[PDB]
C-alpha cells in the first residue's frame with residue numbers, strides 16, 4: 001500500500017488532497033471511489049458544493065445542505081477542507097446574473113453572500129478561495145458580473161469582507177486565498193497576482209495565500225525550474241502557496257499508451273517536486289479529482305481527457321507512482 005497523503009505529511013506538507021464532486025455526482029455513493037479517496041488524501045476540496053449557486057439560490061436565502069453533505073464525507077475521513085469559492089464569474093445564482101444592479105447594490109449582495117457563507121461554515125474551513133479567476137493572461141481584470149458592475153474594487157472588498165466576517169466570529173485563523181490558473185510560471189499573469197497582493201496589503205486587507213490551479217497539458221507542462229521559481233516568488237512575498245487543482249490532460253487520444261503515460265507521469269512529477277522543493281510554505285498539492293471517469297476535462301474540451309492519477313476502473317497510473325516518488329524526494333521511477 002501507498003498513501004499519498006501519508007507520504008506528503010512525512011515530508012513537511014500539510015496534506016495531499018483532491019477535489020471531490022460530492023454530493024453532486026455518483027462519487028457520493030461509489031464505494032470503490034470512496035475507498036481510494038480515504039486511502040490517499042488528507043484534504044478534500046468541494047468541486048461544487050460551496051459555490052454561490054449551491055449556497056444562495058435566491059437572494060438572502062441560504063441552503064447549505066450540499067456543503068454540509070460534502071463536509072460530513074471529508075470530516076469523516078479526517079481531511080482538511082479548502083473551502084471553494086466565494087466570488088467567481090461562473091456558477092453564480094440566477095438572481096444575480098439575471099438582474100440588473102448598481103455597484104452599490106451588487107456590492108451589498110456580494111458582502112451578504114460572503115458574511116453568511118463564511119460564518120456558516122466557520123473554522124470547519126481551513127481556508128477560503130475568496131476570489132477565483134479574476135485576471136486575464138495579460139494581467140488585466142477579467143470579465144464577470146462582479147467586475148463589470150462594481151469595477152476593480154470588488155476584488156479588494158471581497159477579501160475585506162471575508163476578513164471582517166471571520167474576525168466577527170473569532171475565526172481569524174481561516175486562511176484567505178486568491179486562486180487562479182496560468183499563474184504557475186513566470187509571466188504577466190503571475191506578476192499581476194503579486195501586484196494584487198501588494199494592493200490588498202496596502203489597504204490593510206489580509207491575504208494569506210495563492211492557489212495555483214495547475215490545469216496542465218501533457219507535453220506542455222511548465223518545467224520544474226519555472227514552477228519552482230514562481231512558487232519562490234510568491235513565498236518570498238510572504239504568501240503560502242497551494243497547488244489547488246492539479247491535473248495533466250491530453251489534448252488528443254491516446255491517453256493510455258506507454259509513452260503517453262510516461263510523459264504525463266513526468267508532468268505530474270515536476271509539478272509536485274516544485275512544491276516539495278519550495279519548502280514548507282508550499283503547503284501541499286491538491287489534484288482536481290483523481291478518477292478519469294469523473295474528470296471535468298472531457299465535457300469541457302471535446303477529445304481531451306485522461307487527466308487524472310487513476311483511470312476509469314480506478315487503476316493507478318504511472319503518474320500516481322511518480323507523484324509518490326516526488327513526495328518522497330526520490331527520482332521518478334516510472335518516467
Ligand SMILES: *[C@@H]1O[C@H](CO)[C@@H](O[C@@H]2O[C@H](CO)[C@@H](O[C@@H]3O[C@H](CO[C@@H]4O[C@H](CO)[C@@H](O)[C@H](O)[C@@H]4O)[C@@H](O)[C@H](O[C@@H]4O[C@H](CO)[C@@H](O)[C@H](O)[C@@H]4O)[C@@H]3O)[C@H](O)[C@H]2NC(C)=O)[C@H](O)[C@H]1NC(C)=O
Nearest residue numbers: 253254255256257258261310311312313314315316317318
Ligand atoms: C485504464 O483504462 C484505460 C481505458 O479507459 C486503459 O487503456 C487501454 O490501455 C491499453 C494498454 O495500454 C491499450 O491497448 C493497447 O493499444 C495499443 C495500440 O493499439 C492500436 O492499434 C489498434 C489495432 O489497430 C487500434 O485499434 C488502436 O486505436 C491503436 O491504433 C496496442 O498496440 C496494444 O496491443 C499489443 O498487444 C498485446 C495484447 O495482445 C498488448 O498486451 C501489448 O501491450 C501490445 O501493446 C494494446 O491493445 C488501449 O488502447 C487503451 N484504451 C484506450 C481506449 O486508449 C488502461 O490500460 C487502464 N490502465 C491504466 C494504468 O491507465
Ligand SMILES: *[C@@H]1O[C@H](CO)[C@@H](O)[C@H](O)[C@H]1NC(C)=O
Nearest residue numbers: 054062063064065066067069
Ligand atoms: C436545500 O437543498 C437541498 C439539497 O439539494 C434540497 O434537497 C432541498 O430541497 C433544499 N431545502 C430547502 C428547505 O429549501
